[PDB]
Amino acid sequence: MDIDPYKEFGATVELLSFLPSDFFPSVRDLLDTASALYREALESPEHCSPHHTALRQAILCWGELMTLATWVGNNLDLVVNYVNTNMGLKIRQLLWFHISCLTFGRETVLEYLVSFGVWIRTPPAYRPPNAPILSTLMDIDPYKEFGATVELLSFLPSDFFPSVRDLLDTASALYREALESPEHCSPHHTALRQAILCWGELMTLATWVGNNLDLVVNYVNTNMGLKIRQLLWFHISCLTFGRETVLEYLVSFGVWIRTPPAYRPPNAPILST
Amino acid sequence: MDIDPYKEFGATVELLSFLPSDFFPSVRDLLDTASALYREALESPEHCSPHHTALRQAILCWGELMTLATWVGNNLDLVVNYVNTNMGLKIRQLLWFHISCLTFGRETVLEYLVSFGVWIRTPPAYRPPNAPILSTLMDIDPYKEFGATVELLSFLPSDFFPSVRDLLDTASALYREALESPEHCSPHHTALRQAILCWGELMTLATWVGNNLDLVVNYVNTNMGLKIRQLLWFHISCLTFGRETVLEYLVSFGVWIRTPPAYRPPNAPILST
Amino acid sequence: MDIDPYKEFGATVELLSFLPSDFFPSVRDLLDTASALYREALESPEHCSPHHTALRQAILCWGELMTLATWVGNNLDLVVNYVNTNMGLKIRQLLWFHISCLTFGRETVLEYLVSFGVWIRTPPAYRPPNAPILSTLMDIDPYKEFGATVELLSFLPSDFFPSVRDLLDTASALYREALESPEHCSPHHTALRQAILCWGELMTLATWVGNNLDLVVNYVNTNMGLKIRQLLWFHISCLTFGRETVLEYLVSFGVWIRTPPAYRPPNAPILST
Amino acid sequence: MDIDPYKEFGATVELLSFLPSDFFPSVRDLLDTASALYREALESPEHCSPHHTALRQAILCWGELMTLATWVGNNDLVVNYVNTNMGLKIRQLLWFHISCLTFGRETVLEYLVSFGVWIRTPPAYRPPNAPILSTLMDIDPYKEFGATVELLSFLPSDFFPSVRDLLDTASALYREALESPEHCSPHHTALRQAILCWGELMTLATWVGNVNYVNTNMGLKIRQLLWFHISCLTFGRETVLEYLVSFGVWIRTPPAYRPPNAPILST
């Protein structure tokens, strides 16, 4: 799947390439800006916007990118300036786009990307002195806006969830025409596009540790692979079975696992359509 | 042309990849099932369904794949277990899909491919014991449903028909947006998609004989190439000129060939738009 | 951008590949035909047709292809028979398509390309003697139909205009879905599709001089690169800012350049959205 | 930008090439005819005609040519060059506008055709009387437009762009009407004459260079004329006239009693 993170919001990757690489603030400057203004809505049990759904996933994706980044530094700073060049640059553009579309409006940021493009394409002998400005003058749960918890997702066994290869094959076989659509179509589609993109960022970083500096691939499939297996399984199943069905299946299969085998139905529950 | 055999029926190739490779019955088990239930409608002079059109072509494609398979065995069983691995697997999925969509309904088989996908993605420690089942509890003429015969197509000379390169170039230049469409659009489009796919299966098999074991390419252009040249010419011309025009052109050019040259119009008939 | 020159007119490149390479007349025979019939409308200050817009650009593109062709012959006839084989063949098909669609109607030329395809696919033993015929029995300004001149575009400094890389990046980031559309959508889109295609023809020819016979790339960025930078800048800006705004900006920035710095506003004018 | 001095008046250069070069009266004879008949109108604050406007710039252009010619004779070989090249084109322009003021414009255009028939006739059949036209001074260049020389005298010499930069602004904005066969304004008529007056001034200066003090005496006067008519076409006449008032208050104010930025002409 070639999924654009900006396509459902009316932008593309090449449209945000109009701003230079050093236009964007640091991740600390942007994560402080989100918590200064949207910390009560980014931790709300509501969707509230597609921009809030896409911002919650990018905040959790950077934490998993930085969990792997410090772990390689303990178990081999050459790893961390590669993250700031490749993965952290994509995080900074994605954080900047959603924070400023919340602050200023999505049409305003799309008008501004065009206006800054005309300004930066001007040669410096004819460029105006003032650039265009956009001025109008935190622990997140990935499942909370969908009615679940990390506690309810871990209520099921660790080895219950299918492989990350089988889930990306399922999303490609069933939702490739909608995950690559320029529409939102659901909050499940928004949270699933970011999960597919974030797994590509970690799989880019994990093979870079493997080629340059192979114990890291076992670690990412234990901690970050299990978290992406539950995240892919949750949103795929809520698309094909419904969100209320998957929430009741989590407490049906969970109590069935806890029940002694002599006093439960003999076969495991399953979701079927 | 990248044509999917399942795209007009609401499926794809990656959706039928949910079932494993050894899920599908043998070709003998599936050809007996079609003759046990649909032998009077697969030999009817009617379309009756897009599933019947697509099933008639797959039955004739397997006969031409097995005509070439035994001929290489006489004129070099290493050839026949390559057919069972590559071409015969694609035949078994295609026979299974149309026979079961006729038997059970097309929406039922599409629901079943999803339900079997959830079951096979489950790890075996948590998988239910009973898999999903789909249970609800022969000489074909390729031209007969279109009003022609093999006898009427051979009424024209052998070297009249254009090359297979020129006909695939014509279908690409004129019908690529409709042959790759997810619609049916005609019974001519259904029978033409299978002919383009079947020529790719024979051209895959014929170069495999050429690389591994070059007399085979002369044989496929004599017997199977002439049959695919008339099949491509018939459906392309019926799309651009109309089916009733091509049926009258076959008896106009055919009798003109038989007539002595002193008593016919001096130039050959042609189809023009 | 993969732009087809014929896609907005209902044809494609593979549809005009039905005619052989030596079907098309020479460029002298086609440029004389355009001046014999359409010289007063190809020099008019009007659009008059999408066929007239596309024909004006192809005439100017051949002049810039032949300006570079004779300049290499003075500053290294092996260069000029490469132009007649590769770039001049594309010019001859493009000149033939628009001149005959003006003369005979666009639906007539599209019917004729199919009818000639049936005739040329026929083997010569069965081919009729008479082929299908299409018979019904000059200095251009690129900006004149848009309200500007070459004199008004050179009223701005030479180094004002952005690089040809930045302008093709801007058209890709903002108009790729419409420049590759099968619609016309504007006379600005028609004149911009031909400019992107013509720069590819000159960049193909300029590296062929560089590989086979590197002073030529400096020459094309002085004469032909400056002309394509103003042409790309004009049509991109008229799409995002409006045509009347860019025409007033050309006389605002032009007089501001001429004004002494003590008696003008201190910063250069800019276009902003 | 090639401007025909007679295209807005119904003639061409090729139509006035029917008359020979020695047909035309001397500049002194033509300026006396203008002074005796048209002086209260050629020194009037009115336009009164497009012929009066074109005649005012032609009298003022000959004075700048004679000021340039009498200087380079002090620093008579050049006066035989002025009378052969620049004095001849002034004499055609002075004759044409005096005669279209005296006899009317359609009489002079008809007289040009009739003199061509006479001059093309072989001399055995050409009548002895040539056809003749019988049946009927300190000028300010800005006075007909509401301005004066004194009103524009406050703008410093570095206010104005180059003559090249002013001829490009005229060609990039107004070439379609400066080469038109219409009048379109009195600002277009005066602009046509000033571009041709600079062309006569420049060919004299490049000839005597085979010296460019003309860029502080005559090029400065051309630059204000080129600026005033371009600006009055761009911004309007009343916008330029009230800008010249407000710029003069600013430039008469000493430093430390004025804002450090001059007024800008726009909007």
Side-chain angles (χ1 to χ4, degrees):
Chain A
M1 271 182 280
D2 285 331
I3 303 182
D4 196 274
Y6 308 102
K7 195 169 156 187
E8 55 171 351
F9 306 103
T12 63
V13 157
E14 44 183 354
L15 180 52
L16 275 84
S17 70
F18 283 175
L19 321 171
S21 175
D22 43 8
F23 175 81
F24 300 95
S26 60
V27 198
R28 192 72 259 145
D29 290 333
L30 289 158
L31 285 177
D32 291 334
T33 315
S35 84
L37 299 164
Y38 304 107
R39 197 191 171 108
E40 64 271 16
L42 290 174
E43 297 173 354
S44 194
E46 293 177 352
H47 301 125
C48 317
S49 184
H51 286 294
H52 278 107
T53 306
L55 205 42
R56 286 168 190 129
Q57 305 290 319
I59 287 162
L60 296 155
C61 184
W62 178 244
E64 300 289 87
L65 274 168
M66 284 316 291
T67 297
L68 178 54
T70 76
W71 178 91
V72 173
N74 297 119
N75 294 317
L76 58 89
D77 55 354
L78 170 56
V79 64
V80 76
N81 57 3
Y82 168 73
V83 181
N84 300 153
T85 304
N86 290 262
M87 278 74 60
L89 175 58
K90 303 186 178 80
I91 290 295
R92 283 156 64 211
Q93 309 184 27
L94 201 63
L95 286 178
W96 177 88
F97 182 77
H98 296 306
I99 286 163
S100 60
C101 276
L102 281 170
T103 316
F104 301 107
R106 198 193 48 100
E107 288 99 309
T108 303
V109 187
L110 290 183
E111 288 173 355
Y112 167 73
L113 285 156
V114 181
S115 298
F116 199 91
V118 185
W119 182 90
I120 198 68
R121 274 195 307 274
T122 314
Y126 309 98
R127 212 183 268 150
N130 59 99
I133 199 70
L134 191 48
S135 287
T136 178
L137 215 56
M138 197 163 53
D139 187 56
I140 319 289
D141 198 281
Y143 310 103
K144 190 190 188 202
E145 42 164 345
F146 304 100
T149 330
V150 191
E151 201 198 31
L152 190 50
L153 262 294
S154 66
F155 192 48
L156 269 57
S158 174
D159 62 328
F160 167 75
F161 294 92
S163 181
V164 71
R165 188 64 257 160
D166 291 334
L167 290 161
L168 295 167
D169 281 354
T170 310
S172 298
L174 278 77
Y175 308 103
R176 188 196 211 98
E177 67 271 15
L179 287 175
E180 298 175 347
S181 178
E183 295 292 328
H184 297 300
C185 310
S186 71
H188 288 293
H189 285 98
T190 307
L192 191 61
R193 285 162 187 137
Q194 310 275 338
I196 293 157
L197 285 158
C198 187
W199 181 246
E201 303 315 306
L202 271 75
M203 278 290 109
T204 290
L205 166 62
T207 70
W208 181 89
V209 180
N211 289 116
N212 284 170
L213 295 174
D214 194 2
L215 195 147
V216 63
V217 185
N218 190 306
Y219 165 68
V220 295
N221 288 136
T222 316
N223 303 69
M224 279 82 72
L226 176 55
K227 293 201 215 70
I228 206 72
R229 274 161 55 209
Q230 309 171 23
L231 193 51
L232 284 174
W233 179 91
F234 184 70
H235 290 301
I236 286 163
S237 302
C238 282
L239 277 178
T240 172
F241 302 114
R243 195 189 43 84
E244 307 77 20
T245 307
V246 180
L247 287 187
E248 297 156 9
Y249 174 78
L250 282 153
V251 302
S252 305
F253 186 81
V255 186
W256 183 93
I257 277 291
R258 305 310 202 275
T259 300
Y263 305 100
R264 60 183 194 201
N267 48 5
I270 211 168
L271 292 166
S272 181
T273 186
Chain B
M1 271 182 280
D2 285 331
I3 303 182
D4 196 274
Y6 308 102
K7 195 169 156 187
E8 55 171 351
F9 306 103
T12 63
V13 157
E14 44 183 354
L15 180 52
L16 275 84
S17 70
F18 283 175
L19 321 171
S21 175
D22 43 8
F23 175 81
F24 300 95
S26 60
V27 198
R28 192 72 259 145
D29 290 333
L30 289 158
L31 285 177
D32 291 334
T33 315
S35 84
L37 299 164
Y38 304 107
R39 197 191 171 108
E40 64 271 16
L42 290 174
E43 297 173 354
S44 194
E46 293 177 352
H47 301 125
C48 317
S49 184
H51 286 294
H52 278 107
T53 306
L55 205 42
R56 286 168 190 129
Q57 305 290 319
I59 287 162
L60 296 155
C61 184
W62 178 244
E64 300 289 87
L65 274 168
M66 284 316 291
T67 297
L68 178 54
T70 76
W71 178 91
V72 173
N74 297 119
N75 294 317
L76 58 89
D77 55 354
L78 170 56
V79 64
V80 76
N81 57 3
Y82 168 73
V83 181
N84 300 153
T85 304
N86 290 262
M87 278 74 60
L89 175 58
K90 303 186 178 80
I91 290 295
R92 283 156 64 211
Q93 309 184 27
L94 201 63
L95 286 178
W96 177 88
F97 182 77
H98 296 306
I99 286 163
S100 60
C101 276
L102 281 170
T103 316
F104 301 107
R106 198 193 48 100
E107 288 99 309
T108 303
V109 187
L110 290 183
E111 288 173 355
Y112 167 73
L113 285 156
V114 181
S115 298
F116 199 91
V118 185
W119 182 90
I120 198 68
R121 273 195 307 274
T122 314
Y126 309 98
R127 212 183 268 150
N130 59 99
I133 199 70
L134 191 48
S135 287
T136 178
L137 215 56
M138 197 163 53
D139 187 56
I140 319 289
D141 198 281
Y143 310 103
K144 190 190 188 202
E145 42 164 345
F146 304 100
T149 330
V150 191
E151 201 198 31
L152 190 50
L153 262 294
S154 66
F155 193 48
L156 269 57
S158 174
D159 62 328
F160 167 75
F161 294 92
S163 181
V164 71
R165 188 64 257 160
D166 291 334
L167 290 161
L168 295 167
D169 281 354
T170 310
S172 298
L174 278 77
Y175 308 103
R176 188 196 211 98
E177 67 271 15
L179 287 175
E180 298 175 347
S181 178
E183 295 292 328
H184 297 300
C185 310
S186 71
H188 288 293
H189 285 98
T190 307
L192 191 61
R193 285 162 187 137
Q194 310 275 338
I196 293 157
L197 285 158
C198 187
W199 181 246
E201 303 315 306
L202 271 75
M203 278 290 109
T204 290
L205 166 62
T207 70
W208 181 89
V209 180
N211 289 116
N212 284 170
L213 295 174
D214 194 2
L215 195 147
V216 63
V217 185
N218 190 306
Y219 165 68
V220 295
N221 288 136
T222 316
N223 303 69
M224 279 82 72
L226 176 55
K227 293 201 215 70
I228 206 72
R229 274 161 55 209
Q230 309 171 23
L231 193 51
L232 284 174
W233 179 91
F234 184 70
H235 290 301
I236 286 163
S237 302
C238 282
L239 277 178
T240 172
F241 302 114
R243 195 189 43 84
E244 307 77 20
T245 307
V246 180
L247 287 187
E248 297 156 9
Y249 174 78
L250 282 153
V251 302
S252 305
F253 186 81
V255 186
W256 183 93
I257 277 291
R258 305 310 202 275
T259 300
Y263 305 100
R264 60 183 194 201
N267 48 5
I270 211 168
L271 292 166
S272 181
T273 186
Chain C
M1 271 182 280
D2 285 331
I3 303 182
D4 196 274
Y6 308 102
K7 195 169 156 187
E8 55 171 351
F9 306 103
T12 63
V13 157
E14 44 183 354
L15 180 52
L16 275 84
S17 70
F18 283 175
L19 321 171
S21 175
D22 43 8
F23 175 81
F24 300 95
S26 60
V27 198
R28 192 72 259 145
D29 290 333
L30 289 158
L31 285 177
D32 291 334
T33 315
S35 84
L37 299 164
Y38 304 107
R39 197 191 171 108
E40 64 271 16
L42 290 174
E43 297 173 354
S44 194
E46 293 177 352
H47 301 125
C48 317
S49 184
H51 286 294
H52 278 107
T53 306
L55 205 42
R56 286 168 190 129
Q57 305 290 319
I59 287 162
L60 296 155
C61 184
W62 178 244
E64 300 289 87
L65 274 168
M66 284 316 291
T67 297
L68 178 54
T70 76
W71 178 91
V72 173
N74 297 119
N75 294 317
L76 58 89
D77 55 354
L78 170 56
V79 64
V80 76
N81 57 3
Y82 168 73
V83 181
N84 300 153
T85 304
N86 290 262
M87 278 74 60
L89 175 58
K90 303 186 178 80
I91 290 295
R92 283 156 64 211
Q93 309 184 27
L94 201 63
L95 286 178
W96 177 88
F97 182 77
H98 296 306
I99 286 163
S100 60
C101 276
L102 281 170
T103 316
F104 301 107
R106 198 193 48 100
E107 288 99 309
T108 303
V109 187
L110 290 183
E111 288 173 355
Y112 167 73
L113 285 156
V114 181
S115 298
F116 199 91
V118 185
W119 182 90
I120 198 68
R121 274 195 307 274
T122 314
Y126 309 98
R127 212 183 268 150
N130 59 99
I133 199 69
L134 191 48
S135 287
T136 178
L137 215 56
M138 197 163 53
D139 187 56
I140 319 289
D141 198 281
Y143 310 103
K144 190 190 188 202
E145 42 164 345
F146 304 100
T149 330
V150 191
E151 201 198 31
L152 190 50
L153 262 294
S154 66
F155 192 48
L156 269 57
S158 174
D159 62 328
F160 167 75
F161 294 92
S163 181
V164 71
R165 188 64 257 160
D166 291 334
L167 290 161
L168 295 167
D169 281 354
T170 310
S172 298
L174 278 77
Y175 308 103
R176 188 196 211 98
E177 67 271 15
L179 287 175
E180 298 175 347
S181 178
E183 295 292 328
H184 297 300
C185 310
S186 71
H188 288 293
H189 285 98
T190 307
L192 191 61
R193 285 162 187 137
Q194 310 275 338
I196 293 157
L197 285 158
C198 187
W199 181 246
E201 303 315 306
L202 271 75
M203 278 290 109
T204 290
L205 166 62
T207 70
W208 181 89
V209 180
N211 289 116
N212 284 170
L213 295 174
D214 194 2
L215 195 147
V216 63
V217 185
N218 190 306
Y219 165 68
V220 295
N221 288 136
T222 316
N223 303 69
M224 279 82 72
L226 176 55
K227 293 201 215 70
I228 206 72
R229 274 161 55 209
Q230 309 171 23
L231 193 51
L232 284 174
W233 179 91
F234 184 70
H235 290 301
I236 286 163
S237 302
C238 282
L239 277 178
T240 172
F241 302 114
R243 195 189 43 84
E244 307 77 20
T245 307
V246 180
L247 287 187
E248 297 156 9
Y249 174 78
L250 282 153
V251 302
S252 305
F253 186 81
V255 186
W256 183 93
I257 277 291
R258 305 310 202 275
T259 300
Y263 305 100
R264 60 183 194 201
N267 48 5
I270 211 168
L271 292 166
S272 181
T273 186
Chain D
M1 186 174 47
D2 184 47
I3 293 187
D4 188 22
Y6 320 94
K7 187 165 293 182
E8 53 174 353
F9 304 107
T12 45
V13 164
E14 298 93 34
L15 184 52
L16 275 81
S17 65
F18 285 176
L19 313 157
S21 295
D22 41 355
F23 163 81
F24 296 94
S26 84
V27 187
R28 184 70 268 164
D29 282 356
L30 278 162
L31 289 170
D32 294 0
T33 315
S35 300
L37 294 172
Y38 298 99
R39 188 199 267 253
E40 58 91 20
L42 281 189
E43 300 178 345
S44 178
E46 296 291 328
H47 294 114
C48 281
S49 184
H51 283 296
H52 278 105
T53 305
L55 193 46
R56 281 157 185 144
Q57 320 298 319
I59 292 159
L60 287 155
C61 188
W62 176 249
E64 292 176 353
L65 288 170
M66 278 290 103
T67 316
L68 161 65
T70 191
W71 191 98
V72 308
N74 305 328
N75 297 115
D76 59 74
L77 184 61
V78 64
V79 75
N80 296 115
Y81 185 77
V82 175
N83 290 336
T84 318
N85 300 268
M86 278 68 69
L88 196 146
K89 309 183 77 158
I90 290 296
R91 269 161 48 204
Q92 300 195 5
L93 196 56
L94 287 183
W95 179 92
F96 181 75
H97 289 301
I98 282 159
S99 305
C100 297
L101 279 180
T102 313
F103 309 104
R105 198 199 59 191
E106 275 84 12
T107 305
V108 180
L109 299 175
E110 279 172 19
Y111 171 79
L112 281 168
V113 178
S114 295
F115 203 92
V117 176
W118 185 87
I119 201 69
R120 285 175 320 191
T121 318
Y125 305 96
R126 162 166 33 194
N129 42 306
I132 206 157
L133 277 152
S134 293
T135 291
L136 263 68
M137 194 164 49
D138 196 2
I139 302 169
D140 205 293
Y142 310 96
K143 163 179 40 61
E144 36 172 341
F145 296 108
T148 52
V149 163
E150 299 87 44
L151 190 65
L152 278 86
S153 63
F154 292 109
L155 304 158
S157 281
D158 61 298
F159 176 87
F160 312 102
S162 298
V163 188
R164 183 71 268 167
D165 293 334
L166 280 162
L167 286 161
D168 297 3
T169 316
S171 179
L173 274 77
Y174 297 111
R175 187 184 196 155
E176 43 264 41
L178 287 187
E179 309 193 323
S180 181
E182 303 264 29
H183 294 299
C184 297
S185 68
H187 285 295
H188 283 99
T189 304
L191 208 43
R192 285 167 190 126
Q193 306 288 324
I195 296 163
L196 297 154
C197 184
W198 183 248
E200 303 303 314
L201 277 170
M202 265 289 109
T203 60
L204 202 159
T206 62
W207 183 85
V208 300
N210 299 6
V211 62
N212 277 27
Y213 77 107
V214 313
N215 281 120
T216 185
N217 293 88
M218 275 74 64
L220 183 58
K221 297 203 66 174
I222 280 292
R223 267 154 77 199
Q224 317 179 22
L225 261 175
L226 285 184
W227 177 81
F228 182 75
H229 293 305
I230 282 171
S231 301
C232 279
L233 284 174
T234 306
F235 311 107
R237 187 199 284 182
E238 311 205 348
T239 310
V240 169
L241 286 188
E242 79 171 332
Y243 168 74
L244 283 172
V245 163
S246 295
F247 191 91
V249 187
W250 183 87
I251 199 61
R252 284 191 304 276
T253 315
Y257 304 122
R258 59 179 187 205
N261 282 4
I264 298 307
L265 181 48
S266 292
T267 315

